[PDB]
Design a protein around this ligand. Sequence first.
Ligand SMILES: *P(=O)(O)OCC(C)(C)[C@@H](O)C(=O)NCCC(=O)NCCSC(=O)CCCCCCCCCCC
Ligand SMILES: *Cc1c(COP(=O)(O)O)cnc(C)c1O
Ligand SMILES: *Cc1c(COP(=O)(O)O)cnc(C)c1O
Ligand SMILES: [Zn+2]
Ligand SMILES: [Zn+2]
Lengths: 71, 70, 83, 81, 128, 124, 401, 399
Amino acid sequence: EERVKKIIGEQLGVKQEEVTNNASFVEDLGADSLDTVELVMALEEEFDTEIPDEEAEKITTVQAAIDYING
Amino acid sequence: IEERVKKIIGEQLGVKQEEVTNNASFVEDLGADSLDTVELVMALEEEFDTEIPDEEAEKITTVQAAIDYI
Amino acid sequence: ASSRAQVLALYRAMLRESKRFSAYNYRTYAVRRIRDAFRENKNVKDPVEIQTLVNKAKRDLGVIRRQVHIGQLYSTDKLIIEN
Amino acid sequence: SRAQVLALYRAMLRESKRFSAYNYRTYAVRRIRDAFRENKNVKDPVEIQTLVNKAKRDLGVIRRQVHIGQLYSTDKLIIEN
Amino acid sequence: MSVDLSTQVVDHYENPRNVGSLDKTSKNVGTGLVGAPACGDVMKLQIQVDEKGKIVDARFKTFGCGSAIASSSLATEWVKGKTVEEALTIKNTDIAKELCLPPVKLHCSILAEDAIKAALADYKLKQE
Amino acid sequence: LSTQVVDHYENPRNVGSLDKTSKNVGTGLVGAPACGDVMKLQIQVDEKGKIVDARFKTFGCGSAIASSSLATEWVKGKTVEEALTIKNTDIAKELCLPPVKLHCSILAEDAIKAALADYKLKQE
Amino acid sequence: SSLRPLYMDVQATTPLDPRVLDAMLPYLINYYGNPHSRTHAYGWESEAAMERARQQVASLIGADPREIIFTSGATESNNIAIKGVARFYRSRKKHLITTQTEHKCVLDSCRSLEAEGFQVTYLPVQKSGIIDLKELEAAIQPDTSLVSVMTVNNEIGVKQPIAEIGRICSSRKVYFHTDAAQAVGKIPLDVNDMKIDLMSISGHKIYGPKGVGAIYIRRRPRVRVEALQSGGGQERGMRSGTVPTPLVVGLGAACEVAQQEMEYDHKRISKLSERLIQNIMKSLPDVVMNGDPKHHYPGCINLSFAYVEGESLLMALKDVALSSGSACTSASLEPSYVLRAIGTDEDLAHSSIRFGIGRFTTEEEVDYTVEKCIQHVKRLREMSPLWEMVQDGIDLKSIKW
Amino acid sequence: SSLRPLYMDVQATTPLDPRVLDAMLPYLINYYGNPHSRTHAYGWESEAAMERARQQVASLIGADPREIIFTSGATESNNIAIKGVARFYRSRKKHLITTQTEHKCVLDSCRSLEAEGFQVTYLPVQKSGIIDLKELEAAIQPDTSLVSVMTVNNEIGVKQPIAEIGRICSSRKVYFHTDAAQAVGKIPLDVNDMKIDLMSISGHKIYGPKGVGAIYIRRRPRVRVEALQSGGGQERGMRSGTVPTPLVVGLGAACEVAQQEMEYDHKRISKLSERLIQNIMKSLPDVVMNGDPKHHYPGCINLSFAYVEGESLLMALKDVALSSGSACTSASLEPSYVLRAIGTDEDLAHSSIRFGIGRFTTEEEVDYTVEKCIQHVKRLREMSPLWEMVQDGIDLKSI
Ligand SMILES: *P(=O)(O)OCC(C)(C)[C@@H](O)C(=O)NCCC(=O)NCCSC(=O)CCCCCCCCCCC
Ligand SMILES: *Cc1c(COP(=O)(O)O)cnc(C)c1O
Ligand SMILES: *Cc1c(COP(=O)(O)O)cnc(C)c1O
Ligand SMILES: [Zn+2]
Ligand SMILES: [Zn+2]
């Protein structure tokens, strides 16, 4: 369903419990900017979308990603 | 220098400009075969920078038809 | 029952694709040889030999497509007579 | 800048992942990653501009070679299953 | 999927037939272990014969190329329920024909033949 | 291939011929041995010993053509004694001739001196 | 970054036929296996392509595939023929016969053999450029090991009477080799009809890839050759080294295509050649064609423009890629030995240029080249002292150094 | 299931690096001029590209561009070095020195020279595959003109002590040639630091195109070499013939890329090699590595699997392209002379296969190869009579 959380952990190698909806990739999950790029690309491959750079720029939290991956 | 497709047609079929009446037929009137007509319609696509698609192009057999389409 | 129509599209395609060659020599040679070839075989009546020529023309159509594409990828200046 | 840099990274990854060949694809992706990460902490702007320009040339090469591989593809590897 | 590698050889390799070993102590089994010269291809072939001279089963183990393994397996299939004298008629050329072996791999067939003859010699030698 | 050579190539100055019968015209017709580079250079001398104009025609490579054009341009308005100081090495330096083409410069110098020699021979 | 000039120098090299590049690319991308790898699929597919190409060459020249050896080019091929045949029979035969217009690789190989104690006769040619068969017969010696004569001249295009030479050599039990680099794919060649024993083939002369060639070594009445490149024994032991798969694949594609289009190419190339020559001659006097037009390949036209130096004309035609046998423009200032062989006056030897008409040449290129040729020959003639003297009727008496 | 198998045979040849092909195509399409045509623009641009590539190669090996001669491959280069040097100085020197593990082109060139009246010393190697320097010094004679030793072996991957050999040869006024086909672009090479006089380079060993190579001929002290290919004198008269522009362009691109990526490639290649070896050794006993691992290039791993014949194993791994030095795999049935030279028992010589790890090999490829290798080696051992006897012990078995 919204198992993007799984993906996030796979991308960041963090326990499924540590992908809190209110979590920030950099502030909380220890990712750099590159990790974030590879993350949004992994979501592009998993959900068959093309969230443009101007749209990707706003994806900084898990709940934001879940939200976007609904439309 | 307007709908001078006649020039193009004349160049392709090598007929005098006077024999390019709007009522002229490529095969019946201007002595062209089917291949010559293919190269002709392509020549119009290249001259007017268009892509008269196949489903529409199939019906272009007269000068007035060519003028009409554009 | 004539394959005439199948031929014609092929002709059209083979000319159109050939006309995209970036290089003067390849473009001119391809177009002229396509024309002269179709015209030379216009009077063939044997359906099997005709199908043979059609299949060969299809292989050459794929070749022309790939080579025109590559020639676009590595294009260069036009010839002095091009302008 | 910085955003331009990241845009470059994304572009080179997206284009690289289209390689038809397993060896070319995997190699391209991994080398791009290791390269950007290896240069992550460089500070000299001139060397940075150099690396960026090199990355642009390598991006054009990646595009052209990916297209070539698409025009002349073949069967996949046994390990792709 | 190959070149000068016949399909029959591939069948006798990927699907080795009569692979195994018997008890050399049963006095009713003749075991011949002969190896090839130039190409260290070694063949171990054991045959088991009940009374009346008929081969009741055959097993082998071979250290060698695919053509040697397949040649030996084919040997065991051929050395099925034939006369101990019948086995004397097995010729290397029949094997090479059966498998379409090129000249470079004939060392296999000549070895397989040898193995058969090595086994028969031990059996007769087992009858004091 | 230097740019100066290209400029004198077809942009050559003073291409033509003069009247060989004039006692005031010196005509030098020199051919090279190694190849077939031939140079004809004619000069016209005023009463004061100044070269008032010169014309040439040369059958040879581009570097020889340019060498001769530069030669006639240089002898523009100089003294018959002044012109003797024109050196082939000055020509090759002016044109940046590579070593393979120095025979052109040597031919131009040779032509100049032969033509001046013809003039002096006509005054007697 | 200005516009590019027309290519009229097909005798030096030819562009790749896009079909050939398409034939090569799969092996430059995905099929990179070594054809000598016998233990996996990459080798199997590479070998398959190589052998297919071999059959293609054999089909073009009418030989058995087993008689085709892949090389790096026509130069290596001629080296193998001359040095291999020469050395093999050295114990009993030390005389060779070739001609003075042969390519520089044949001549220089023969020169090295002379430095090694061999005897070599360089047959002269008639003013037409064609050898005299009688001098060939009378020149053959009992200890003659090899006769080498090129099929088509690379500078003037004259065709030698290959078939009759084959008959002569056969009747004398002498090996016959032909440098066919400029003929393969342009004129019909059959080794058996022509009694040919060895033949040289260049890949980049027939719109194939650079860096690959072939040598035909007859296997029927077997021909013995000493291998020059030592190694692992590839190519029946005649040419050790890794067979360059993509290059030979391209070579085969080129030979096959040439077999398909040979007649058509000859028709239109001949038309363009006649057009160029006839149009230039009708507008410029004292222009002489070098080589007999009765036995001449139309794709190579060598013309001398009397009273005009070659390199000056080339510089005039900065928009057309050409070549000349002029002393000038040659590293060691040296006139073409080919033109000296046909007895060309020194002036015309310095006044010759070579036009190449090829598979891809257009009529427009021909007309442009003709116009510029007329214009600039006129301009240079108004600049030429020899022209002036001829128009005045002077006497050849220049002064030298 | 017509899927293609993994490539683990980088020592036989390597794919084009897309960078090299991109470097080549313009000269296969638009820039088709002959580099020896001096009178028009097509020739000029071809020559320009060719000379630039030359600077690329020289830059990779630290030589002067004038010291790089283009050839058709490493075979032609080795022929030029050995036969050329040997012939030039024949009037006063007729002894050559090489080793028993050199490539067949060096060996056969030396053989032809033997047929030409030269005497040739084939140095043996230690079981490690490394020559013994003392035997090299002691082997040189007053009329020794040339020493030939390859840098890295193509069958076992051992690295020879190039620098010390250079010192010795230099101190004796003897020419030093090295077949560097297996080292260029994989391990560091500097011609001057190593006192090298001639070196062979092959394009298709370093992700370049097939059909092109180079020979480095020193100009500093100068080395005299007799040209083998007669012709018009191209390449300073050493190698007549039309230089194949696209091929030399690709070779140069390959050399530049190799200079860029050599360190990275060595790091990950070495890590993967250690992975393969350690993982195979822990799961299959009686597997022996041929060649000293202390002086060894990780890209070439030659292993003998006791009690198993090589070609049967190769056929078992129908999903991996490999190689073996087993007699039962050569046209003329012949076991690898390299393995025989390093003293490997003949039986284990028949049990060797070669894994090559290259610039593009993935860790997944390594793990797959390891797993299938274990599985099929076990299966074949249960089929092997030598296995059975070893578990029970025994000696001969007639021939
Ligand atoms: P963000 O979280 O702040 O990330 C930090 C970044 C890198 C974005 C930025 O802030 C930063 O730290 N910059 C310092 C250094 C830098 O920006 N370097 C960028 C250029 S690195 C480079 O050169 C890439 C290497 C390209 C080679 C790839 C070759 C692939 C193989 C080709 C196959 C055909
Ligand atoms: C062009 C040519 C050659 C050149 O051969 P390559 O090895 O391909 O460069 C040889 N002989 C003749 C007659 C040629 O015209
Ligand atoms: C592969 C190899 C060669 C082969 O050279 P080619 O370029 O194929 O002619 C020669 N020597 C060594 C050591 C090699 O590994
Ligand atoms: Zn075997
Ligand atoms: Zn000159």
